[PDB]
Scaffold this active site. Structure first.
Site, short mmCIF file in Angstrom:
data_model
loop_
_atom_site.label_atom_id
_atom_site.label_comp_id
_atom_site.label_asym_id
_atom_site.label_seq_id
_atom_site.Cartn_x
_atom_site.Cartn_y
_atom_site.Cartn_z
N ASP A 33 0.80 -1.21 0.00
CA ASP A 33 0.00 0.00 0.00
C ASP A 33 0.84 1.26 0.00
O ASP A 33 1.28 1.69 1.05
CB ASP A 33 -0.97 0.01 1.18
N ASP A 213 -1.39 5.50 -5.37
CA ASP A 213 -1.95 4.77 -4.20
C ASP A 213 -2.36 3.36 -4.57
O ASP A 213 -3.50 3.12 -4.92
CB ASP A 213 -3.10 5.59 -3.64
C1 LIG Z 1 -5.20 8.12 5.00
O1 LIG Z 1 -4.85 7.52 3.77
C2 LIG Z 1 -5.41 6.47 3.35
O2 LIG Z 1 -6.35 5.89 3.93
C3 LIG Z 1 -4.91 5.94 1.99
C4 LIG Z 1 -4.84 7.18 1.04
C5 LIG Z 1 -6.07 8.06 0.93
C6 LIG Z 1 -5.94 9.44 0.80
C7 LIG Z 1 -7.07 10.23 0.70
C8 LIG Z 1 -8.30 9.60 0.73
C9 LIG Z 1 -8.51 8.23 0.86
C10 LIG Z 1 -7.34 7.51 0.95
O3 LIG Z 1 -5.69 4.93 1.46
P1 LIG Z 1 -5.13 3.47 1.33
O4 LIG Z 1 -4.77 3.23 -0.09
O5 LIG Z 1 -4.03 3.28 2.33
C11 LIG Z 1 -6.50 2.39 1.73
C12 LIG Z 1 -6.05 0.96 1.99
C13 LIG Z 1 -7.18 -0.05 2.13
C14 LIG Z 1 -6.66 -1.47 2.28
C15 LIG Z 1 -8.08 0.28 3.32
N1 LIG Z 1 -7.56 2.49 0.76
C16 LIG Z 1 -8.77 3.05 0.93
O6 LIG Z 1 -9.13 3.58 1.97
C17 LIG Z 1 -9.73 2.92 -0.24
C18 LIG Z 1 -10.73 4.03 -0.37
C19 LIG Z 1 -10.21 5.45 -0.37
N2 LIG Z 1 -9.06 5.87 -0.87
O7 LIG Z 1 -10.99 6.26 0.17
N3 LIG Z 1 -10.31 1.59 -0.18
C20 LIG Z 1 -10.59 0.85 -1.26
O8 LIG Z 1 -10.28 1.17 -2.40
C21 LIG Z 1 -11.35 -0.45 -0.94
N4 LIG Z 1 -12.00 -0.91 -2.14
C22 LIG Z 1 -13.25 -1.27 -2.32
O9 LIG Z 1 -14.03 -1.18 -1.37
C23 LIG Z 1 -13.67 -1.90 -3.66
C24 LIG Z 1 -14.78 -1.08 -4.30
C25 LIG Z 1 -14.38 0.38 -4.39
C26 LIG Z 1 -15.02 -1.63 -5.72
C27 LIG Z 1 -10.41 -1.47 -0.30
C28 LIG Z 1 -11.12 -2.77 0.06
C29 LIG Z 1 -9.15 -1.75 -1.09
#
Ligand SMILES: COC(=O)[C@H](Cc1ccccc1)OP(=O)(O)[C@H](CC(C)C)NC(=O)[C@H](CC(N)=O)NC(=O)[C@@H](NC(=O)CC(C)C)C(C)C
Ligand SMILES: *[C@H]1O[C@H](CO)[C@@H](O)[C@H](O)[C@@H]1O
Ligand SMILES: *[C@H]1O[C@H](CO)[C@H](O)[C@H](O)[C@@H]1O
Length: 323
Positions: A33, A213
């Site tokens: 990640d 990301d």
């Molecule tokens: C504080 O940083 C993080 O949480 C980072 C960056 C971020 C920045 C700004 C906004 C959101 C995220 O996100 P991340 O890539 O570490 C984190 C990791 C995941 C395993 C929980 N991803 C997410 O939170 C993201 C959503 C997002 N960006 O808001 N989650 C997803 O994409 C989720 N996807 C689905 O549900 C599938 C559906 C969309 C078809 C996850 C199960 C992989």
């Protein structure tokens, strides 16, 4: 000097990508990640029922506690996890980090309780946003980077095919042509870069910033851009059962491109059909809203189109069309 290739595999519909990691001799399947900076694992500190379906880390076998240290992380989709911290040997792609902080889970939210595809996360964002308290720890990459031949890693994520994480070297066979680099802003701990303009099919607009990301499934953009994109997709409509804009699976989707330091990064429309929407008979779009946060999330839909080099020298990001 060290280097290695870690092989990633997408789960169904490429929802997440999983890569094996050996921690104190036990291999776990972790979600790499670049959007966060914590290495956390399902552990023997979870209730037994939550360990079922997973490989789990037993800190008592090989770990050394970081006395009085804890971790607690919250992600964009509302998921969270928390626990305590041990250092251990962590091997990725044949590259071993000794004394790497391993964050053993004691609590996991519903989403992780329902995902048996991974055994936790391996963060590859800047270590400054690692959540360990009272002092943050270094990610796997920061722990090993001065031991690597080059202090970089690179990623090829693919549609329904295994891909790679290259640590410490660039595999020039993974892309067409030459890499184009752009400067990274690490001030919020992300692999943040600027785009000078975008093209959403037949319409184009002004630039913005976003983060590379791997931990986010989709390409998350401003609502104005999402609306512009789907205004060109016949019959597109929001379906909250599915996650956003959906459309007939046979739809020929426009491309989406961004301008990055003079390089055009194009996501072909074929990659913007994420997959069957689930509930019934539409497909979910690979472009969806960023919830109003004011920057974009260059998640797996975008990354499947590129080979991307994450270079700590700079720092900078390098892009070229995937091969
Ligand atoms: C504080 O940083 C993080 O949480 C980072 C960056 C971020 C920045 C700004 C906004 C959101 C995220 O996100 P991340 O890539 O570490 C984190 C990791 C995941 C395993 C929980 N991803 C997410 O939170 C993201 C959503 C997002 N960006 O808001 N989650 C997803 O994409 C989720 N996807 C689905 O549900 C599938 C559906 C969309 C078809 C996850 C199960 C992989
Ligand atoms: C990555 O790079 C290192 C350093 O040259 C090699 O030793 C390794 O085999 C791989 O090519
Ligand atoms: C991961 O596995 C794939 C194929 O098995 C790659 O070729 C890498 O070298 C890693 O071993």
């Amino acid at each position: 000097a060290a280097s290695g290739v870690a092989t990633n595999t997408p789960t169904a519909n490429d929802e997440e990508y999983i890569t094996p990691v050996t921690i104190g001799g036990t291999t776990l399947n972790l979600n790499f990640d670049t959007g966060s900076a914590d290495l956390w694992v399902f552990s023997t500190e979870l209730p037994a029922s939550q360990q079922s379906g997973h490989s789990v880390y037993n800190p008592s076998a090989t770990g050394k506690e970081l006395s009085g240290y804890t971790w607690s992380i919250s992600y964009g989709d509302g998921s969270s996890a928390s626990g305590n911290v041990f250092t251990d040997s962590v091997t990725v792609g044949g590259v071993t980090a000794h004394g790497q902080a391993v964050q053993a889970a004691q609590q996991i939210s519903a989403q992780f309780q329902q995902d048996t595809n991974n055994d936790g996360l391996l963060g590859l964002a800047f270590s400054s946003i690692n959540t360990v308290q009272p002092q943050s720890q270094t990610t796997f990459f920061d722990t090993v980077k001065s031991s690597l031949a080059q202090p970089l890693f690179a990623v090829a994520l693919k549609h329904q095919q295994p891909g790679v994480y290259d640590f410490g070297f660039i595999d020039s066979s993974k892309y067409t042509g030459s890499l184009t680099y752009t400067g990274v802003d690490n001030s919020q701990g992300f692999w943040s870069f600027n785009v000078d303009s975008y093209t959403a099919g037949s319409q184009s607009g002004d630039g913005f910033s976003g983060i590379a990301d791997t931990g986010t499934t989709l390409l998350l953009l401003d609502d104005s851009v999402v609306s512009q994109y789907y205004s060109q997709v016949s019959g597109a409509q929001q379906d909250s059962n599915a996650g956003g804009y959906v459309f007939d699976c046979s739809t020929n989707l426009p491309d989406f491109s961004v301008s990055i330091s003079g390089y055009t990064a194009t996501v072909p429309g074929s990659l913007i059909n994420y997959g069957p929407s689930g509930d019934g008979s539409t497909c979910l779009g690979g472009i969806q809203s960023n919830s109003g946060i004011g920057f974009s999330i260059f998640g797996d839909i975008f990354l499947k189109s590129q080979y991307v080099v994450f270079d700590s020298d700079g720092p900078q990001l390098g892009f070229a069309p995937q091969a």
